[PDB]
């Protein structure tokens, strides 16, 4: 007999994830811990500006 | 074995073996691995520090 189980959880912003956590309370807990999850710029150059 | 000789001689000779043998192997390897690792802030130095 031969049992391999493999489960990897990545988490970004939100409440420290632990196994038994449901998605519901997942998705009520980020409700101060927001994370950047996308970000858009300019050059530094840019903002040297007379 | 039966030898009856002369309708008066009788004789009998009846042997029985047996053998019995019975082996049993069990193996069980459980192995488990948890592995947790949260990052909650990024602290830096503010560049004007003293
Ligand atoms: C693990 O092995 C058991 C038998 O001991 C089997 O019933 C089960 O499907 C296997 N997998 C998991 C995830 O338990």
């Known amino acids: 007999l031969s049992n391999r189980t493999n489960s990897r959880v990545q988490s970004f912003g939100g409440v420290p994830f632990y196994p038994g956590i449901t998605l519901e309370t997942w998705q009520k807990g980020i409700t101060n811990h927001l994370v950047a999850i996308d970000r858009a710029g300019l050059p530094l150059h840019f903002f040297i500006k007379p | ?50």
């Open chain 2, 1 to 50: 074995t039966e030898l009856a000789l002369f309708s008066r001689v009788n004789g009998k000779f009846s042997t029985e073996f047996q053998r019995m043998k019975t082996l049993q192997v069990k193996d069980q390897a459980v192995t488990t691995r948890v592995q947790v690792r949260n990052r909650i802030y990024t602290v830096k130095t503010t560049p004007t520090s003293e």
